[PDB]
Design a protein around this ligand. Structure first.
Ligand SMILES: *[C@@H]1O[C@H](CO)[C@@H](O[C@@H]2O[C@H](CO)[C@@H](O[C@@H]3O[C@H](CO)[C@@H](O)[C@H](O)[C@@H]3O)[C@H](O)[C@H]2NC(C)=O)[C@H](O)[C@H]1NC(C)=O
Ligand SMILES: *[C@@H]1O[C@H](CO)[C@@H](O)[C@H](O)[C@H]1NC(C)=O
Ligand SMILES: *[C@@H]1O[C@H](CO)[C@@H](O)[C@H](O)[C@H]1NC(C)=O
Lengths: 338, 400, 96, 145, 50
């Protein structure tokens, strides 16, 4: 069942990109963050990291993760993966490049695993707000209340609703290929991968080879140290160069498609009703800001709505045509008068 | 040859006038003001910044009092407390129960951050303004002269020599008291040296970053340590320099009229377009040529082609030249109604050459002088609908 | 210590210095022109103050932090007007 | 070239003091903090802790911290040196009594290492805010601009 | 409102007048910083009338 999505599993491989605030400065972390999607209602977040979470090398180890350490990857466990904001979050599911979590409200989002001798985390400035379903401006999902048709990301991954292009990655520089042949700069190969190669000085101008040596130039900071390694494909990230050869296809399904689920919503305390001649008096004791709306049923609607936070007592002139009011998300009520 | 002329003070506006030199062919002039630096004289008063309460270790005699001394540290507040029973990680610190006294002292010293971030008070005087002038007159087509405004200093770059100013307006955007904060200028009224109220601006006042002595009125007052613990609780007003940093007014470089901008500099206010300059220039007679060489262009006529009632050079016109010989011919309109961007035109035998100009009158009736040949180019103009151009170059708004 | 304050003057490890941090840039406003008045249709992402300053004799300055998207107007006189939206470079403007 | 600061390294020793809010009360922690200088712009904070981390007992192990426990000092690992605010911070560098870290805005700053069998944390009340340089009053250093 | 308009959910053609302008990449770092107006649909989703 879980091995029925090999379009992403085998054909894609995580790469390294330029995290805005890696650790303490702008480094090139393997967990670079892309496309923070904070659009769900219940504060659920989707994050697209450049590291590939999910299966092991071939098809196994859901509890493992795969990042790229220099020119080669090394799949390890998911031991201490943590996604964090203003307050630490709680991860829900990880799949491919995407992570689903439920974060508290906050202004910054961070993603970071723990290799064991190092942290290797990344963070990006991107605010994430809470938008409570309905008319009751709460801050966290309550344990009870009436449910409403919210919109939220689904924890399921075996979906084909949307796709994202996965072309051959651009080539990557690796100056550690540029060893010294005692007096000349010398290039090895990872596994026979294509090493684009050339220096400022006139020498070998293409590089489609095994381990070459330089005839002309001397300095390792005056040669192109590249690796075309599109035996494994990468996401169409805006942080990697694009190989001018051609743009590969191979679009894979997006893990967490938004769905129209049903979230529990808070229910404000019921009003204390009191009355005088042609006059409703309404006592309100809200715990959180909740919108009150009112509507006269006569020819003139004469609407009135206001967010109320502090406990307050309000009034309403009730004509014989009658009056409706909708405190919180309680069913609307209506009345006559003497 | 000595052509004295008053010039409006604008940066990107030419002054293509014409020299009416008798006995020789008239020569056009052209003067441009690249900069109008003012550079008022200034005198530093003091510099203020956040402070740091460098509290030394307390003096704690276990059994007996200890009178404090009035040390010469700035705002050196010292007070002795009685009846204390300090604990530490190693147990109670003394065996006496009432003779324990603590001698706590504290003084205000300027923060380490003062070396980089620090306000600068300045009292300024009138000073003397300078300008960079470019003059592309005659056939030389170049100058790169830095000049003053005093009505004595000659400027003799290349071949020509001239004198500028003094300015008609003594307007100085700077006030008598000026406060400079790193890069922006505020005309805040710093009170004086050694008088700053605590909490307000200039709570800590230092003569200079090098100067050891300073004036620190921070209302610092120590208080008794609580529950028998070794520390120095000190109560003071919040850093006055921190205040006025988050509620300062608009910088002078953002409220100075006449489009004047400042810089972290001798405090020149460049491009301060105001007033006029009485420009006098001595053209060398070498550039002059005998009048008997300029071709005669008499019996000509001027026809308007298309004038736009706008600020850019939308006005065009064709002149039916009636000349005899061939050569260069300066063109200039003595009247200020219209300004001609074109400077020199070569004359063929009875030819016609269009030129561009700009005007500000619906029906411009302006004289045109063409190498000793007068002609009036009367015509009509049309206002534009797309008022999207560079800044106006006509500079001739008047009754129309 | 009642004896004396010994030597050992020790340098501060991390001295503040005037480096160059990277700051945010607000989205460019949508400029709409009318007859002798400038309408600035803009949408700020974060609270930014904009300053306006007439180039005539009277400055008539105005500083106003704005957070929600808003539409503002400005009477651009023949002298001209200049405005600074956010940390963008200042821009000036004409009037016909 | 890190051996040209022995005046700090050798002539100084670890130190202990009244932390106002050491854990649940005011104990005498070895990492009592004092003079936090939160006056920069990029969100960085300099903290002067009572414990003096740096080289090891003699001259080595820059990545080790040395605090004082009881009568004696004890140079151990720096595994879980934690600096916290309203949100957890991130360490940058440390030298002598002073540790340089960047924190999100908050009302209190806490410092805590890990001996391994012990928590040994300390905090203090101190306003921390960071207004970025410029006219755009943001709240986190942006990717570009 | 209506910053992005599509004739139907399946319509491959759309209109998007969002003032999207690219920016110079900062400090020789490989990225595509763009200056973009805030989402028009997010506005009027916080301040919609009754
Ligand atoms: C002094 O003032 C005169 C008049 O404003 C300046 O003349 C202008 O000089 C610029 C070049 O600095 C000319 O434009 C440039 O010309 C070159 C060569 O044809 C061309 O490659 C550029 O694309 C550009 O068009 C300009 O035509 C000329 N005249 C006018 C009416 O603007 C002069 O440069 C000033 N001299 C100094 C030293 O500042
Ligand atoms: C009616 O409204 C007033 C405010 O206008 C409020 O103070 C009062 O308690 C309410 N009760 C009555 C008199 O109906
Ligand atoms: C600004 O111009 C708009 C143009 O539609 C107008 O509706 C609005 O009232 C003007 N605002 C002010 C303050 O004049």
């Amino acid at each position: 069942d879980l091995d029925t999505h090999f379009t992403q599993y085998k054909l894609a491989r995580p790469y390294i990109a330029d995290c805005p605030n890696c650790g303490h400065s702008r480094c090139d972390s393997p967990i670079a963050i892309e496309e923070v999607r904070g659009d769900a209602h219940a504060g659920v977040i989707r994050i697209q990291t450049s590291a590939m979470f999910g299966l092991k090398t071939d098809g196994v180890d859901l509890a493992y993760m795969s990042f790229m350490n220099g020119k080669t990857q090394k799949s390890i466990k998911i031991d201490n993966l943590h996604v964090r904001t203003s307050a630490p979050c709680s991860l829900v599911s990880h799949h491919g490049y995407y992570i689903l979590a439920q974060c508290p409200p906050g202004d910054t989002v961070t993603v970071g695993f723990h290799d064991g001798p190092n942290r290797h985390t990344c963070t990006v400035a991107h605010k994430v707000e809470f938008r409570p379903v309905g008319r009751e401006k709460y801050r966290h999902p309550p344990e009870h209340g009436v449910e409403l048709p919210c919109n939220r990301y689904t924890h399921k991954r075996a979906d084909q609703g949307h796709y994202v292009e996965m072309h051959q990655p651009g080539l990557v520089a690796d100056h550690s290929l540029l060893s010294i042949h005692s007096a000349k700069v010398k290039i090895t190969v990872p596994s026979g991968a294509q090493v684009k190669y050339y220096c400022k000085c006139p020498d070998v101008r293409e590089g489609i080879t095994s381990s070459d040596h330089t005839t002309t130039c001397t300095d390792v900071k005056q040669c192109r140290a590249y690796l075309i390694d599109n035996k494994k494909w990468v996401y169409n990230s805006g942080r990697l160069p694009r190989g001018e050869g051609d743009t590969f296809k191979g679009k894979l399904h997006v893990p967490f498609v938004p769905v129209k689920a049903k979230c529990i919503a808070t229910l404000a305390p019921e009003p204390l009703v009191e009355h005088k001649h042609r006059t409703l008096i309404l006592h309100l004791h809200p715990d959180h800001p909740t919108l009150l709306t009112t509507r006269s049923l006569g020819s003139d609607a004469n609407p009135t709505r206001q967010w109320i936070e502090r406990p307050t007592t309000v009034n309403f002139t009730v004509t014989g045509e009658g009056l409706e009011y909708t405190w919180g998300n309680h069913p609307p009520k209506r009345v006559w008068a003497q | 040859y000595e052509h004295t002329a008053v010039m409006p003070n604008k940066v990107g506006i030419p002054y293509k006038a014409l020299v009416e030199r008798p006995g020789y062919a008239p020569v056009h002039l052209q003067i441009q003001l690249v900069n109008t630096r003012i550079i008022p004289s200034t005198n530093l008063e003091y510099i203020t910044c956040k402070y740091k309460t460098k509290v030394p270790s307390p003096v704690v005699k276990c059994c007996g009092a200890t009178q404090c001394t009035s040390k010469p540290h700035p705002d050196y507040q010292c007070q002795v407390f009685t009846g204390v029973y300090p604990f530490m990680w190693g147990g109670a610190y003394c065996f006496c129960d009432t003779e324990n006294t603590q001698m706590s002292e504290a003084y205000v010293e300027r923060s380490e951050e003062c070396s980089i971030d620090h306000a600068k008070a300045y009292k300024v005087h009138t000073g003397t303004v300078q300008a960079m002038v470019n003059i592309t007159y005659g056939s030389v087509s170049w100058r790169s002269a830095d000049v003053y405004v005093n009505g004595e200093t000659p400027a003799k770059i290349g071949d020509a020599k001239l004198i500028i100013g003094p300015l008609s307006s003594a307007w100085s955007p700077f006030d008598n008291k000026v406060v400079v904060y790193g890069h922006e200028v505020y005309n805040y009224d710093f009170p004086e040296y050694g008088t700053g109220k605590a909490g307000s601006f200039g709570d800590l006042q230092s003569r200079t970053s090098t100067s050891n002595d300073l004036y620190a009125n921070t209302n610092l007052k120590l208080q008794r340590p609580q529950a028998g613990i070794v520390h120095t609780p000190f109560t003071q007003a919040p850093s006055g320099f921190e205040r006025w940093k988050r509620d300062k007014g608009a910088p002078l470089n953002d409220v100075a009229p006449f489009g004047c901008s400042i810089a972290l500099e001798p405090l020149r206010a460049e491009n301060c377009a105001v007033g006029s300059i009485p420009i006098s220039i001595d053209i060398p007679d070498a550039a002059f040529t005998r009048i008997s060489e300029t071709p005669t262009v008499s019996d000509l006529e001027c026809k308007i082609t298309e004038c736009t009632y706008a600020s850019d050079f939308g006005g065009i016109a064709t002149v039916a030249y009636k000349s005899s010989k061939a050569g260069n011919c300066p063109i200039h309109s003595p009247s200020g109604v219209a300004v001609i961007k074109e400077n020199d035109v070569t004359l063929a035998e009875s030819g016609s050459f269009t030129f561009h100009f700009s005007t500000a009158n619906i029906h411009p009736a302006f004289k045109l002088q063409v190498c000793t040949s007068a002609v009036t180019c009367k015509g009509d103009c049309k206002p534009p609908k797309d008022h999207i151009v560079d800044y106006p170059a006509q500079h001739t708004e008047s009754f129309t």
